[PDB]
């Protein structure tokens, strides 16, 4: 009902996601980036090589490469020492809150860049039931408290709150 209501300021409605309907080892931030990327790739392909299209897509490809390295440590279980020499990188642009490679400020701009491109003032992420298998719901709870903190994003979850307590 919520996604239908907001599909009519303007709040973009993501297709509803659920950790239950996914491979167990799959993270949550990687999915929301994937789920957001398809919703920005569909619009840009609508332009089909316009002057504005090239400028906007150049902004997107530049930013995603920034997220790939910082998140790449989370992709693999063991964190190799080679990342530390590669993890460190001087940059004053994008308003890095803290150095190294941290996704708290990188992903906020990624959410931001969607808003100018999609001409929307808010980003909505809707979830489904995790009562089916709440063991994997911890990574959702960690991602929502770590990489969901921008004033221009809204996140909607559901379920039985006692299972969260459990």
């Amino acid at each position: 009902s919520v996604v239908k209501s907001l599909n009519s300021v303007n709040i973009k409605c993501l297709p509803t996601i659920d950790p239950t309907k996914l491979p167990r080892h799959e993270p949550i931030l990687v999915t929301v980036t994937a789920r957001l990327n398809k919703m920005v790739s569909d619009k840009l392909k609508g332009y089909w090589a316009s002057n504005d299209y090239r400028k906007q897509k150049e902004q997107w490809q530049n930013h995603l490469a920034q997220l790939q390295r910082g998140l790449h440590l989370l992709t693999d279980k063991e964190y190799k020492p080679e990342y530390f020499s590669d993890a460190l990188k001087l940059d004053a642009q994008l308003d890095y809150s803290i150095g190294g490679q941290d996704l708290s400020e990188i992903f906020e701009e990624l959410v931001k860049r969607a808003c100018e491109i999609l001409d929307c003032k808010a980003i909505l992420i809707t979830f489904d039931d995790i009562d089916t298998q709440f063991d994997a719901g911890w990574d959702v709870l960690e991602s929502i408290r770590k990489f969901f903190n921008s004033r221009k994003l809204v996140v909607v979850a559901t379920g039985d709150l006692r299972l969260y307590s459990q």
Binding site: R54, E58, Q61, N62, H63, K89, Q93, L94, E109
Partner: protein, 786 residues
Amino acid sequence: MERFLLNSTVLLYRLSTVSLDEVSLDERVESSVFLAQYEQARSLPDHVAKSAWSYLVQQIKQRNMKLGPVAILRLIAEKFIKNEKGGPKIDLPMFSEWQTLMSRVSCLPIIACHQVFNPGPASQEYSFRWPLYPYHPTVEDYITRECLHETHQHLNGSTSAEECWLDALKHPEACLRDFEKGWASQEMKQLCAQIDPSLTPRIFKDRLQIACNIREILCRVAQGVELPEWIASMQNPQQLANSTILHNGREYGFATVWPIDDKYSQESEFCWLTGLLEKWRFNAPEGLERLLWIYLLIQNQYLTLLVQRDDTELREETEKSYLSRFKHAHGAGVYSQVRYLEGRFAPKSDPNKMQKLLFSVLRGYWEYLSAHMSMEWVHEKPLTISQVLDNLELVEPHGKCVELALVPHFIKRKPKNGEAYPHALLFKDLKNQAAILMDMLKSEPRLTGWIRGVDAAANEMHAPPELFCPLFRVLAKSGIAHFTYHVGEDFPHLISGIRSIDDALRFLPLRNGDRLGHCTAIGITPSIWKRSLPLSLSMTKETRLLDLVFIWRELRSHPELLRYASDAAIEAVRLAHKVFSLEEEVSITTLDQVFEMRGLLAESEGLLSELNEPLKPKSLWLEEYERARELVKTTGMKRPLKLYKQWLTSDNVRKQRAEYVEVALEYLPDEAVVALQQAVMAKMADRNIAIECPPTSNTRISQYRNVSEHHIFRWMGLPGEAIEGDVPMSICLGSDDPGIFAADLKSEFYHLFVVLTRKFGLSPADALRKVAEVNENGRIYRFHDV
């Protein structure tokens, strides 16, 4: 001087650190050009050099352009590239200079420059994948009738070196690790400082990252779109080392989106570059003009580094790149330009690793057939070894498509000290590597029609050729049925190099129809070999002793070169006392008998292991183990054998062998060395064993002043280059390590044809026949099954 503005270490340094805004750099490039040309061609006199650079300067002023890549390529494009019926080709008189140029400059920009400024007729659809070849009607029609027959291609890797540059762009992190892993070894450290001392693993990532970002920046200019406004914060190319440029504190980046999906393809680079030079046909902004100069300098630098380093990425590059390789070898047109191709590959110890690569090559070859042989297969998607062989048994050789015959080549290594005999760790790996091959071949016996040959191409001083006798002979019983060796290319002394080939002839189980690789030892004229060498060389005692015993073998037979034979036999006995530390008398006959039994395996029972040992359970090796055992026990003569055990398992003898000795350069007179070389020819021509010839564009010998002096002409029998008394051999054609960037067998075929017509003055009809004999010998001695 057009070849020093595109491959020059100091110019890259003198332009990378120079900010883009300043333009006055003629006095800095000119100082760089002379310095760079000095460290490359030290023999070029200054007065010729100073005049040559000034001539280039006023030529640009005459053409009314600005000094830079956009102008340098134009002069080369109008110099070398000439349009013809087949499109853009290279003129015959200046083909040889182009091959000299190609060792320093990638051709891809030149064709891109040539196409923009000197386009083809009626803008006919042009697709560039292969390096440019010269045109000659007498030769091009020979290829159409009788296709080329290649013999030595390393399937490990891509087709040429120019596209490997794109792979370095595609895998910046992997190519850094491969360079860093090599940089750990001292040889690469010397080699990198050899090309450029100011090179560090930190710098190599810097240089590659700059090239990638410059590629993105110029692509925006090539697309015609305006710059993304962060070029205001662009002051130095060192900014292009981080992929992140900050302007007014706002986030930015260098990457863009390309019209084609695969930005790192051969087509993408050509469309980018042709588009870029199209928009600079009249004038170019200086800041971006220099940026193109850096990219070409970086591109040539890595290509220059790659070629020398050749004389991880392998796993990623060894999957379905073979289909491109065969398509590259096939060439344009309905029918392939190369019919009989012998692709070599390096076996690996782990059976899963070796099985995976063998399937990839065979599957890749089938994909090449399925694009041409539009005929229904048993399995449409093989995806396994068995279904590939069943599919491949349905094709017939009708002289149009490439025919393949894989040949694994072992890699020799340094003799590890210890383990009771010289190469134990080395032989244990080789014994294991061949064991994986033989049992896997027995698992699918149909592979004997494709796995045809065995080679060993690492070096010569590392492991003597006689070490492969037991491992080859067992492989002969395994059904391989063809043995080739990569012998005689590297040697510490010319007479010693003759011994190495004759070690291969006498010891290796070479049957009639086998081949040898890079027999440079019996090719170089002794007068030519002595050019620019010290008056006394150095070589290991063991290599010296095997020389002295050999030189007695092939010279006492010579009625007039007896003094050398007699002196050698006398002083070889002197050296044997030094090495074996023996106190009794040993004659030259005993020494030869000792050294004729070095082909036996060390671990043969009764030779190194205890004679009374229980019998091993009927392997393919028990024939080898007991054969070296019984003949040692028999003949009633064990005195040479006990000398041989010290030659293998004595602490002092092995140490004395590795101790170096001083040998005079002209130990044998000029005629004396020729006697050995003509003795090899008579022996091997009797055995009828062909010789692989390296590409003549390979300036690896560092002894020939030009191509016209190459030893291949001596073998073929060119008047004025053939030594009297030579026994003509059979010489096949091969292109393994050409030493240049973009090469192919057809280019090598043309290179041979050009030299005969121009330097030696031969008619095109007669010149073709001499080079056609080499191209056909690759078919007479083909390893492909009948």
